[PDB]
Write a protein that holds these residues in place. Structure first.
Motif, mmCIF file in Angstrom:
data_model
loop_
_atom_site.group_PDB
_atom_site.id
_atom_site.type_symbol
_atom_site.label_atom_id
_atom_site.label_comp_id
_atom_site.label_asym_id
_atom_site.label_seq_id
_atom_site.Cartn_x
_atom_site.Cartn_y
_atom_site.Cartn_z
ATOM 1 N N UNK A 10 0.389 -1.656 0.617
ATOM 2 C CA UNK A 10 -0.074 -0.575 0.230
ATOM 3 C C UNK A 10 1.129 1.308 -0.523
ATOM 4 N N UNK A 11 1.818 1.338 0.397
ATOM 5 C CA UNK A 11 2.837 2.420 0.904
ATOM 6 C C UNK A 11 3.766 2.127 -0.064
ATOM 7 N N UNK A 12 4.314 1.229 -0.615
ATOM 8 C CA UNK A 12 5.636 1.311 -1.005
ATOM 9 C C UNK A 12 6.851 1.498 -0.861
ATOM 10 N N UNK A 13 7.756 1.846 -1.116
ATOM 11 C CA UNK A 13 9.310 2.041 0.208
ATOM 12 C C UNK A 13 10.240 3.420 -1.025
ATOM 13 N N UNK A 14 10.208 4.502 -0.102
ATOM 14 C CA UNK A 14 10.960 5.463 -0.528
ATOM 15 C C UNK A 14 12.511 5.599 -0.219
ATOM 16 N N UNK A 15 13.346 6.093 -0.399
ATOM 17 C CA UNK A 15 14.675 6.238 0.374
ATOM 18 C C UNK A 15 14.840 7.608 0.251
ATOM 19 N N UNK A 16 13.867 8.916 -0.049
ATOM 20 C CA UNK A 16 14.059 9.930 -0.036
ATOM 21 C C UNK A 16 13.478 10.614 0.635
ATOM 22 N N UNK A 17 13.374 11.920 1.120
ATOM 23 C CA UNK A 17 11.972 12.640 1.094
ATOM 24 C C UNK A 17 11.237 12.475 0.352
ATOM 25 N N UNK A 18 9.852 12.684 0.386
ATOM 26 C CA UNK A 18 9.169 12.783 -0.775
ATOM 27 C C UNK A 18 7.668 13.049 -0.590
ATOM 28 N N UNK A 19 6.465 13.412 -0.508
ATOM 29 C CA UNK A 19 5.399 13.845 -0.330
ATOM 30 C C UNK A 19 4.270 12.631 -0.476
ATOM 31 N N UNK A 20 3.486 12.931 0.612
ATOM 32 C CA UNK A 20 2.543 11.808 0.027
ATOM 33 C C UNK A 20 2.155 12.328 -0.617
ATOM 34 N N UNK A 21 0.104 11.779 -0.156
ATOM 35 C CA UNK A 21 -0.317 12.224 -1.699
ATOM 36 C C UNK A 21 -1.615 12.917 -1.124
ATOM 37 N N UNK A 22 -1.034 13.777 0.084
ATOM 38 C CA UNK A 22 -1.780 14.717 0.160
ATOM 39 C C UNK A 22 -1.123 16.247 0.607
ATOM 40 N N UNK A 23 0.180 15.699 0.230
ATOM 41 C CA UNK A 23 1.044 16.505 0.242
ATOM 42 C C UNK A 23 2.153 17.112 0.843
ATOM 43 N N UNK A 50 15.850 9.085 12.788
ATOM 44 C CA UNK A 50 17.157 8.498 12.662
ATOM 45 C C UNK A 50 17.876 8.101 13.634
ATOM 46 N N UNK A 51 18.496 9.773 14.035
ATOM 47 C CA UNK A 51 19.695 10.414 15.013
ATOM 48 C C UNK A 51 20.234 10.021 14.356
ATOM 49 N N UNK A 52 21.091 10.570 13.155
ATOM 50 C CA UNK A 52 21.612 11.170 12.313
ATOM 51 C C UNK A 52 21.193 12.412 11.602
ATOM 52 N N UNK A 53 22.197 12.997 10.864
ATOM 53 C CA UNK A 53 21.708 13.521 10.126
ATOM 54 C C UNK A 53 22.193 13.079 8.728
ATOM 55 N N UNK A 54 21.283 13.498 8.128
ATOM 56 C CA UNK A 54 20.409 12.815 7.132
ATOM 57 C C UNK A 54 20.265 12.711 5.972
ATOM 58 N N UNK A 55 20.711 14.134 5.889
ATOM 59 C CA UNK A 55 20.873 15.291 4.763
ATOM 60 C C UNK A 55 18.903 14.734 3.494
ATOM 61 N N UNK A 56 18.427 14.528 4.277
ATOM 62 C CA UNK A 56 16.796 13.818 3.257
ATOM 63 C C UNK A 56 16.968 12.162 2.712
ATOM 64 N N UNK A 57 18.837 11.363 2.998
ATOM 65 C CA UNK A 57 18.329 10.345 2.204
ATOM 66 C C UNK A 57 18.514 9.227 3.372
ATOM 67 N N UNK A 58 17.192 8.237 3.273
ATOM 68 C CA UNK A 58 17.824 6.993 4.481
ATOM 69 C C UNK A 58 18.292 6.223 4.176
ATOM 70 N N UNK A 59 18.451 4.987 4.831
ATOM 71 C CA UNK A 59 18.904 3.517 3.920
ATOM 72 C C UNK A 59 17.978 2.686 3.807
ATOM 73 N N UNK A 60 17.726 1.382 3.651
ATOM 74 C CA UNK A 60 16.568 0.270 3.783
ATOM 75 C C UNK A 60 16.448 0.320 4.786
ATOM 76 N N UNK A 61 17.800 -0.214 5.677
ATOM 77 C CA UNK A 61 17.620 -0.537 7.014
ATOM 78 C C UNK A 61 17.153 0.349 7.945
ATOM 79 N N UNK A 62 17.205 1.612 7.912
ATOM 80 C CA UNK A 62 16.059 2.526 8.017
ATOM 81 C C UNK A 62 15.540 2.916 8.622
#
Ligand SMILES: [Cl-]
Ligand SMILES: [Cl-]
Length: 162
Positions: A10-23, A50-62
């Motif tokens: 239902x949700x999919x997986x995005x490892x980069x900040x994104x916008x939901x269906x509502x914005x 996440x507990x870390x500086x992420x610069x907007x991207x996370x790993x699959x693990x996170x």
């Protein structure tokens, strides 16, 4: 199939900040970051989560970690809620997944507001509850996902996800 597999479809997986269906700003598997418009307020929320500086991207693990926490929170919110718990207690394993799904997407407060449909699920009147859930903003906004959840409640099987 199980709640995790169901939500991952239902949700999919995005490892980069994104916008939901509502914005709203989201990342991962449907993890809402913030409702604010600020990408920055969202980057901050992400780092806090996440507990870390992420610069907007996370790993699959996170992403999976956040997903595990959110499902757990979905379930505990339902069991703590006076309106939801009795609905949950009353349902079989499949339909329970369906209610967790709704709580994951809209939060406990929101699901809690489907008073008439909740009442019909509790009474095991599947076809009528399905008809009633369909006249909701929810249904109108995310119709495909909502049809999947609705059929799961109507039928008690994982058909819609197969
Ligand atoms: Cl969090
Ligand atoms: Cl949809």
């Amino acid at each position: 199939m199980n709640i995790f597999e169901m939500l991952r479809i239902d949700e999919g997986l995005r490892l980069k900040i994104y916008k939901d269906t509502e914005g709203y700003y989201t990342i991962g598997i449907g993890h809402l970051l913030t409702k604010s418009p600020s990408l920055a307020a969202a980057a901050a929320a992400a780092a806090a989560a996440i507990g870390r500086n992420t610069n907007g991207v996370i790993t699959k693990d996170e992403a999976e970690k956040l997903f595990n926490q959110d499902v757990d929170a979905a379930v505990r919110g339902i069991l703590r809620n006076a309106k939801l718990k009795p609905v949950y207690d009353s349902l079989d394993a499949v339909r329970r997944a369906a209610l967790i799904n709704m709580v994951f997407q809209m939060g406990e407060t929101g699901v809690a507001g489907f008073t008439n449909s909740l009442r019909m699920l509790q009474q095991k009147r599947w076809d009528e509850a399905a008809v009633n859930l369909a006249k909701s903003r929810w249904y109108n906004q995310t119709p495909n996902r909502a049809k999947r959840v609705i059929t799961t409640f109507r039928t008690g099987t994982w058909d819609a996800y197969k």
